[PDB]
Amino acid sequence: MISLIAALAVDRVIGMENAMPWNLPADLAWFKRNTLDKPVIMGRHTWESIGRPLPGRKNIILSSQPGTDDRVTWVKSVDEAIAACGDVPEIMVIGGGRVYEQFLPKAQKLYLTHIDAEVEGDTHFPDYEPDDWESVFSEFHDADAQNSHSYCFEILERR
Ligand SMILES: Nc1nc(=O)c2c([nH]1)NC[C@H](CCc1ccc(C(=O)N[C@@H](CCC(=O)O)C(=O)O)cc1)C2
């Protein structure tokens, strides 16, 4: 089963850590918790963004150019990436934009963090149809001393 995990701001805008204006350690814990011990696919852009493999997860990088770092698995297509994962219960797609777009029609689940923030950003999460997805989990949290803004965790599974 394919899963997408992402953080969204006002208007489906998503961006990198340093691009991000918020500070949400709880969002981090949630990402950790839901992606640990699972393979995670990401685009070249995200990878460079992160600069180190994520521990306790098999990191598979999607890119068209040959890879330049043996600490991760480099793949050339959606299909290839899916196969390098092997037979596991759940694959996690971590972005970015192009990546999300491509896996979405393959996914059955969406783990999303809704950040009550307005920011101008070059990129967005794909417009998906709500009639096709059922919200099975939801939890709103107010800001606090740790978390800079209010956020909502949500999990939808494809109908
Ligand atoms: N929920 C969610 N939130 C996000 O901010 C992102 C997504 N999904 N998906 C896409 C993307 C991933 C960006 C991203 C950047 C750094 C680390 C990272 O260092 N994570 C550590 C957490 C450190 C800690 O948990 O204290 C990890 O081990 O996963 C993870 C994800 C951004």
Side-chain angles (χ1 to χ4, degrees), residues 4-15 17 20 22-35 92 100 110-117 125 128 137-141 147 149-156:
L4 273 65
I5 179 152
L8 290 63
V10 182
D11 287 353
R12 295 195 288 102
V13 170
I14 62 178
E17 216 79 308
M20 317 323 260
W22 61 71
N23 196 22
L24 303 172
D27 177 46
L28 281 177
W30 169 253
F31 169 94
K32 182 191 209 40
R33 187 156 61 253
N34 300 308
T35 67
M92 303 292 288
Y100 277 144
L110 323 161
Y111 292 83
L112 324 171
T113 304
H114 290 293
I115 309 160
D116 318 338
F125 194 77
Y128 60 97
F137 169 91
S138 157
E139 163 189 284
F140 178 68
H141 293 289
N147 313 295
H149 299 59
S150 63
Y151 51 107
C152 209
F153 293 124
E154 181 177 42
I155 307 156
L156 304 180

